[PDB]
Amino acid sequence: QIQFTRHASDVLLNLNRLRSRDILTDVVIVVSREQFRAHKTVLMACSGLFYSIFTDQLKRNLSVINLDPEINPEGFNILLDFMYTSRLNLREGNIMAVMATAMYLQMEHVVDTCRKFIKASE
Amino acid sequence: ADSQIQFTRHASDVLLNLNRLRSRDILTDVVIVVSREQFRAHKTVLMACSGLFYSIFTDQLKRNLSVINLDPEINPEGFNILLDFMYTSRLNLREGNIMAVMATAMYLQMEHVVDTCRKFIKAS
Ligand SMILES: C[C@H]1CN(C2COC2)CCN1c1cc(NC(=O)Cn2cc(-c3cc(Cl)c(O)c(C(N)=O)c3)c3c(=O)n(C)c(C(F)(F)F)nc32)c(Cl)cn1
Ligand SMILES: C[C@H]1CN(C2COC2)CCN1c1cc(NC(=O)Cn2cc(-c3cc(Cl)c(O)c(C(N)=O)c3)c3c(=O)n(C)c(C(F)(F)F)nc32)c(Cl)cn1
Ligand SMILES: [Cl-]
Ligand SMILES: [Cl-]
């Protein structure tokens, strides 16, 4: 069929615009003292943890999810921006936190990219 | 010591997973009614892909509606082609459907689809 090569990226951009305007967000993720509003569909599409949560009968209808308090909010922020943008901002000062947060969120390609960053920088 | 990494497959992988959720009726939040067919979807995806749906659901008086009735003169098969396009990036244009898809894309305010329809006509 006719393939629109920019369509998926344009969809994601528009989803990120909805998130910035707080339109149809349906969950708050709490990470220590920081709160992040998001769309469950995007979280589920991007994360094994969120897919498991929002397919679990006991948890799927929650509108507030408290993540492990040991997770670094900056690590989560970097990963949530990645979910909505395809762009992953890695630095020596954040790599360990992003990698551990990606393991927790079950984002395997992000973890592999973090390993590649360690290989390139250690 | 620093790197800004673009994941070139990420957006298409997100969209595939959204289509998987729709196919299982997970987190769908609206039924679009088009003449003799009902279609379930995610409002966020509809808004992301169509000027009409963007305008409808940005309106706070319509944002939380669970059923939207479209103009009854819209061809439901044209709509289904466009809904599948929204969730897949693939558009099935054929001589037997081009006029219906084009007219539906005008109504949904999907300009790059409309333009692709015009290119199809030009090449027919
Ligand atoms: C279950 C699956 C297959 N099933 C088939 C098999 O028989 C039928 C059809 C239904 N499918 C399905 C899956 C959905 N969501 C997920 O898969 C959640 N998800 C997302 C990712 C993910 C996505 C993108 Cl886009 C990325 O860029 C990256 C990255 N850069 O790291 C990571 C991911 C992951 O890395 N991992 C290990 C995992 C983990 F679970 F393995 F841990 N889960 C991840 C959604 Cl929403 C809807 N349907
Ligand atoms: C308004 C915009 C920019 N604004 C910036 C500018 O300063 C601040 C920020 C907020 N923004 C925003 C917009 C959102 N949604 C839409 O734009 C709706 N949408 C989507 C499309 C569209 C999208 C994809 Cl992916 C396609 O593949 C195709 C296609 N192949 O045809 C068509 C589309 C369109 O073609 N047309 C004419 C129109 C129309 F309205 F013009 F008619 N609307 C379309 C969403 Cl959800 C969230 N935020
Ligand atoms: Cl914006
Ligand atoms: Cl599948």
Curated annotation (Swiss-Prot), chain A:
Task: Identify the disorder associated with this protein.
Answer: Chromosomal aberrations involving BCL6 are a cause of B-cell non-Hodgkin lymphomas (B-cell NHL), including diffuse large B-cell lymphoma and follicular lymphoma. Approximately 40% of diffuse large B-cell lymphomas and 5 to 10% of follicular lymphomas are associated with chromosomal translocations that deregulate expression of BCL6 by juxtaposing heterologous promoters to the BCL6 coding domain. Translocation t(3;14)(q27;q32). Translocation t(3;22)(q27;q11) with immunoglobulin gene regions. Translocation t(3;7)(q27;p12) with IKZF1 gene 5'non-coding region.
* Protein name according to UniProt: B-cell lymphoma 6 protein
The shown chain, on whole-protein numbering, covers 8 to 129 of 706
PTM note says: Phosphorylated by ATM in response to genotoxic stress. Phosphorylation induces its degradation by ubiquitin/proteasome pathway.
Q: Which organism does this sequence originate in?
A: Homo sapiens (Human)
- Where does it reside? Nucleus
User: Taking every annotated instance into account, which residue ranges of this chain make up the domain BTB?
Assistant: 25-92
| Top-level taxon of the source organism | Eukaryota
* Consequence of changing residue 14 to K: Abolishes interaction with NCOR2 and HDAC2, no effect on interaction with CTBP1 and transcriptional autoinhibition
Function as written in the Swiss-Prot or TrEMBL entry: Transcriptional repressor mainly required for germinal center (GC) formation and antibody affinity maturation which has different mechanisms of action specific to the lineage and biological functions. Forms complexes with different corepressors and histone deacetylases to repress the transcriptional expression of different subsets of target genes. Represses its target genes by binding directly to the DNA sequence 5'-TTCCTAGAA-3' (BCL6-binding site) or indirectly by repressing the transcriptional activity of transcription factors.
- Subunit notes for this chain? Homodimer. Interacts (via BTB domain) with the corepressors BCOR, NCOR1 and SMRT/NCOR2; the interactions are direct. Forms preferably ternary complexes with BCOR and SMRT/NCOR2 on target gene promoters but, on enhancer elements, interacts with SMRT/NCOR2 and HDAC3 to repress proximal gene expression. Interacts with histone deacetylases HDAC2, HDAC5 and HDAC9 (via the catalytic domain). Interacts with ZBTB7 and BCL6B. Interacts with SCF(FBXO11) complex; the interaction is independent of phosphorylation and promotes ubiquitination.
Summed up, the tissue specificity of this protein is: Expressed in germinal center T- and B-cells and in primary immature dendritic cells.
Q: What induces it?
A: Down-regulated during maturation of dendritic cells by selective stimuli such as bacterial lipopolysaccharides (LPS), CD40LG and zymosan. Protein levels decreases upon genotoxic stress in a dose- and time-dependent way.
Q: Which gene encodes it?
A: BCL6
Entry remark concerning the domains of this protein: The BTB domain mediates homodimerization. Its dimer interface mediates peptide binding such as to corepressors BCOR and NCOR2. Interaction with corepressors through the BTB domain is needed to facilitate the rapid proliferation and survival of GC B-cells but is not involved in the T(FH) formation and BCL6-mediated suppression of T(H)2 and T(H)17 differentiationrequired for GC formation.
